[PDB]
């Protein structure tokens, strides 16, 4: 079966109006919500969450539609898998636990939920950390030949259904393992705990979960972009103190200098590179956990 | 099984130093070479070639690596599937037939071979017609969010092997049929002869054929782009009289105004939209054949 990678952490099924959020919960102290991205689940935090649980109440959540969270039915505008909708759902989930003001760190898609949360509902966040992303608007505005080859999956997974679903279903194991490996510094799976890979692979083997991931990327090409575009053309900046962390060999540093971009989006931003590919908490767990503890405390 | 869609045409296997080129040959008069694109074969010309064969010797050729033409071995730079190499191979094939000066019409990938032929060896062409393309450099230069989504397959099929090969293997029948239908005005397969669709489906069923198509798009992302860049920078223009046809709902018209672009690339170019999606000779065979006859006469 699937391994428990958070020894001592509790498990919670949090009801919301859009379905249940699964989370592991551990620690004590100020609340800290950790959000994963694609093609992973909450267990990507398993190397950094124990160190964070020494100082914080750490809630490690599967995104709406991911992992063991429920999958709301999507619609023609991919509404439940827009980051605006996901942020609202997670705000609800945290309200169910009594957390109306919390710290938040996200990676990949979860970092896109995080900064959208901070634009829409800044009063909910004490501090924000985003790992190896630039805003969705910035990726699309920088989509030239070199970047279109590098993050082809942004345009491939956003193709109308069922085109990417039908291609992904012939050999799902190949695709999830290809994405994990190709975005690491070494280019293989050595940075990952093999028990964590099994979580990712099992989640990706469900065709409904794969459809959700495509809906996430469809939202990323359309409504998420439009939502971002409104803010940046209006000069709306994130007022929450924030940390932008990126991998020297990761995705965000390709096609832009991350700190200069985030300073356009956030009034109070600090940044640091980490020698790592895209998967900061697994490739560089110690370095990531130390940056996060220092920033949040 | 596979129908003969060219009543009265002979079937020739033309030997070159890179492998055999398969061609249907009919008519008499000045030689006219017709080149197909992706994901099709020579049979895409089956509704227009008989009307052209009333006034020309019409040679309907499978591109190197496509259809029934031989598949040369590729290499690290995808050399045999660069449009420069494909043009040299087709010049060799025409020489085997005694044709050193000929008319040329190409569609999709075949139109890219054609305009590269016109730039490299303009002395070989009397007149050139390209159907529903802009130069490869122009597509990559106009790469933005909108175009990345519309021609996602330019970045997807160019990913390093075996990523697109594996995914296309997930459902090849769906993918070739999805590509045919989605680029038509109607949005389904009703514009195609079902017997022609069988030709495209059978060719796409061969994994080695699908690999060649990926090598073509890899060339399109790298060497083909660099070859085009040299010409723009040196200001090299096509000196051959050219006709540019495009679909009102086709690919070229979304990127930019196609005649305006081609005038930057050609000193003598006429142009016209056809009421059509991407597949002009099948969606609009009368308008396409009429425009080609008038131009080539």
Curated annotation (Swiss-Prot), chains A, B:
Fluoroacetate binds at residues 109, 112, 153-154, 217. One of its GO terms (molecular function) is haloacetate dehalogenase activity. Its EC number is 3.8.1.3. Changing residue 183 to F: Reduced catalytic rate. Minor effect on substrate affinity. Pfam families: Abhydrolase_1. The keyword Ubl conjugation does not apply. Gene3D superfamilies: alpha/beta hydrolase. Catalyzes the hydrolytic defluorination of fluoroacetate to produce glycolate. Has lower activity towards chloroacetate and bromoacetate. Belongs to the AB hydrolase superfamily. Epoxide hydrolase family. This is Fluoroacetate dehalogenase. It comes from Rhodopseudomonas palustris (strain ATCC BAA-98 / CGA009).
């Amino acid at each position: 079966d699937l391994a428990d990678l958070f020894p001592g952490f509790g498990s919670e099924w949090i009801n919301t109006s859009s379905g249940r959020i699964f989370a592991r919960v551990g620690g004590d102290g100020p609340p800290l919500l950790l959000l994963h991205g694609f093609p992973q689940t909450h267990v990507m935090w398993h190397r950094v969450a124990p160190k964070l649980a020494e100082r914080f109440k750490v809630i490690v959540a599967d995104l709406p539609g991911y992992g063991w969270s429920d999958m709301p039915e999507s619609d023609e505008q991919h509404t439940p898998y827009t980051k605006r909708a996901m942020a609202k759902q997670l705000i609800e989930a945290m309200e169910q636990l009594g957390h109306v003001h919390f710290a938040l760190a996200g990676h990949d898609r979860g970092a896109r939920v995080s900064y959208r949360l901070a634009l829409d509902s800044p009063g909910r966040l004490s501090k924000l950390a985003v790992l190896d992303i630039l805003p969705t608007y910035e990726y699309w505005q920088r989509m030239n030949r070199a970047y279109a080859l590098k993050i082809y999956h942004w345009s491939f997974l956003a193709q109308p259904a069922p085109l990417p679903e039908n291609l992904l279903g012939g050999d799902p194991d190949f695709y999830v393992k290809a994405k994990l490996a190709s975005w690491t510094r070494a280019g293989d799976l050595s940075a990952f705990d093999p028990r964590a890979v099994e979580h990712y692979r099992i989640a990706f083997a469900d065709p409904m979960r794969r459809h959700v991931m495509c809906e996430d990327y469809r939202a990323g090409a359309y409504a998420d972009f439009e939502h971002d575009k409104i803010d940046v053309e209006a000069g709306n900046k994130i007022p929450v103190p924030m940390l932008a962390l990126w991998g020297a060999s990761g995705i965000a540093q390709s096609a832009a200098t991350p700190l200069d971009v985030w300073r356009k989006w956030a009034s109070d931003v600090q940044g640091a590179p980490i020698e790592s590919g895209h998967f900061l908490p697994e490739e560089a767990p110690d370095q990531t956990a130390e940056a996060l503890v220092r920033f949040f405390s």
